[PDB]
Amino acid sequence: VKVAVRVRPFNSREMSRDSKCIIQGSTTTIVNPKQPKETPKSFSFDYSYWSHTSPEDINYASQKQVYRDIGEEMLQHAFEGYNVCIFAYGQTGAGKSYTMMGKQEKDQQGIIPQLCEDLFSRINDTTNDNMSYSVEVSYMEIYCERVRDLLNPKNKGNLRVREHPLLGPYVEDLSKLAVTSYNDIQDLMDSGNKPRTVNETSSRSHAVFNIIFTQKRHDAETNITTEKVSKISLVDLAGSEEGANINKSLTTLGKVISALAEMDSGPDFIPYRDSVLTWLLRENLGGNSRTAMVAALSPADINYDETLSTLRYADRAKQIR
Ligand SMILES: Nc1ncnc2c1ncn2[C@@H]1O[C@H](COP(=O)(O)OP(=O)(O)O)[C@@H](O)[C@H]1O
Ligand SMILES: [Mg+2]
């Protein structure tokens, strides 16, 4: 797996913009009529999430759905070790926040909230007297190559993304604290999401919600616990590139995709330092550790270029490991 796209019914700016929809299969239809042409195409897109109507519409991409499809499977791999990713990419107002952290009230949740929950349930259901996992998580915002401990509001004893000669990239301490208890964990997020509030320009940033699943198996053959960790990173990178303000953020990443998108002739040295964001995630992005994506589109015809822009180099995610 690795890719999917999701469209949002309509937002105010749209609702009053007397703008209807262009995006109507398993693939994305994309028209424009304000040029003539019929194109572009539909593109593969493992998943072309249809959520244009109302959660009452039988034909509706339910929240629980997107999870049981991308997240669920993505959580499974974790148990069997192997790290994983899930980025919500977009165009400001595309639907990234919802599809990752939705809304607190019953129903309207993201994959994050559901994923942990699963994890948590996954762990307490138990089955054997030697589990021992312990949940370790962190919530950072990457703004102008300038992280921020959404977990610990006043941070401290920090700087940027440092590289551990062997353990891989990380950051100066930051904030890392177990808790074990969905509710305990659930809370963390909350506090976090709030740590950011300047239109909310919290957009020119990207929030990484990474968790450290450590697995300790008991031998039952010459006592010998076995440390089996997995890294679970879900991000909501910036979106939409009138284009007041720039910064590596995008590009950095904008560079990686061209990379993982470049095999030719049957089946590398990988270029991501040049991509601070990719930095944060080594193996999980450069070979090893499966990875899936979610793009959120806007039904508005007033947004046919940016969105379309999204579809294309979304379709582009087809080549690497
Ligand atoms: N599939 C969906 N179902 C219901 N509401 C949605 C959906 N997708 C987006 N939204 C709406 O859009 C808003 C959030 O979009 P958002 O994730 O914040 O944008 P972005 O992350 O691209 O900046 C919410 O207030 C929500 O009502
Ligand atoms: Mg947002």
Q: What is the four-CA torsion angle of 136, 142, 148, 150, rounded to 10 degrees?
A: -50
Helices assigned H by DSSP within 171-260: 182-193, 249-260
Would you call 154 a catalytic residue per the annotation? no
96: annotated binding-site residue?
A: yes
Would you call 96 a catalytic residue per the annotation? yes
- The type of residue at 95 is G
Q: Three-state DSSP class for 215?
A: strand
Give strand pairing partners of 30: none
Would you call 95 a catalytic residue per the annotation? yes
The structure tokens listed for 301 are 């015809």
Which of these is catalytic: 89, 98, 143, 182?
A: 98
Resolution (A): 3.6
Ligand 1-lining residues (CB < 6 angstroms): 6, 8-9, 11, 51, 90, 92-98, 239, 296
The sign of the CA dihedral 144, 93, 296, 28 is negative
First to last CA, the chain: 11
CATH number at residue 145: 3.40.850.10
Q: How far is CA 283 from CA 12, 180, 233, 288, 289, in A?
A: 40, 26, 12, 6, 6
What determination technique applies here?
X-ray
Gap from CA of 25 to ligand 1 centroid (Å): 23
Domain that holds residue 146: 1-321
Dihedral-angle region of residue 82 (phi above 0 means left; psi in -120 to 50 means alpha; beta otherwise) = left
User: For residue 294, which ligand has an atom nearest its CA?
Assistant: 1
Gap from CA of 11 to ligand 1 centroid (Å): 8
The answer to whether 132 and 225 are in contact (CB under 8 A) is: yes
Q: Would you give the DSSP letter of residue 118?
A: H
Q: Three-state DSSP class for 297?
A: strand
Q: Three-state DSSP class for 260?
A: helix
As for how many domains the chain has, the answer is: 1
Q: How far is CA 245 from CA 10, 144, 203, 307, in A?
A: 25, 11, 11, 19
The structure tokens listed for 128 are 């054997």
Residue ID of nearest Cα to ligand 1 atom 20: 93
In 3D space, the residue among 276, 256, 275 whose CA is nearest the CA of residue 319 turns out to be: 256
